[PDB]
Design a protein around this ligand. Structure first.
Ligand SMILES: *C(=O)[C@H](C[C@@H]1CCNC1=O)NC(=O)[C@H](Cc1ccccc1)NC(=O)c1cc2ccccc2[nH]1
Length: 179
């Protein structure tokens, strides 16, 4: 079923470009959105070919101070994202038979069946650590970062990396988005 993923594409998931290239952005509520940290959003970001000022950005770490590979940004806009925090679990959550939802200029409105999303934890890519990751046995590619991992009406992760055969996401929990 594509219905839940589609509802997020319509109201929450946007094509963006930063100085690092093309990414999928997840708007969570109000003016608050999340990107993979390595997208390095600057003082402005291109959202579907519109220049948008970024008011604040925080590169999240866990309590040990280790990178989570997620950056929260506040956009300078009067638009509000429909609040999806209720779909984000309170704890980092594995999932079965997930759909990775990608939306960039190169990969528009894309629904990728990635299979089960399984615990991984501490992951090192390019020599850089990330905590709270999960893995799927699907050959994800460049350009898919920021993709939204969904399963059974839950939003559980953001795509961050891959080795050519498997893919990895940063897990989401609801408290990351609390005010
Ligand atoms: C999204 O931008 C991209 C998606 C990757 C590319 C290959 N397949 C995918 O699914 N992510 C990356 O390129 C990450 C960026 C990153 C993430 C966290 C910390 C630091 C950098 N990097 C990788 O996926 C990556 C690095 C390396 C190095 C050697 C072999 C394979 C690698 N994958």
């Amino acid at each position: 079923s594509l219905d839940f993923a589609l509802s997020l594409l319509r109201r929450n998931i946007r094509q963006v470009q930063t100085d690092q290239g093309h990414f999928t952005m997840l708007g969570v509520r109000d003016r608050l959105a999340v990107l993979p940290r390595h997208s390095q959003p600057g003082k402005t970001i291109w959202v579907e070919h519109k220049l948008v000022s970024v008011l604040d950005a925080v590169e999240l770490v866990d309590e040990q101070g280790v990178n989570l590979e997620l950056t929260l940004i506040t956009l300078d806009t009067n638009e509000k994202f429909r609040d999806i925090t209720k779909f984000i679990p309170e704890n980092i959550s594995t999932a079965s038979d997930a759909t990775l939802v990608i939306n960039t200029e190169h990969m528009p409105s894309m629904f990728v069946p990635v299979g089960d999303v399984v615990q991984y934890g501490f992951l090192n890519l390019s020599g850089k650590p990330t905590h709270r990751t999960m893995m799927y046995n699907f050959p994800t590619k460049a350009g898919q970062c920021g993709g939204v991992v969904t399963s059974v009406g839950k939003v559980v992760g953001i795509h961050i990396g891959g080795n050519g055969r498997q893919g990895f996401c940063a897990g989401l929990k609801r408290s990351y988005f609390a005010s």
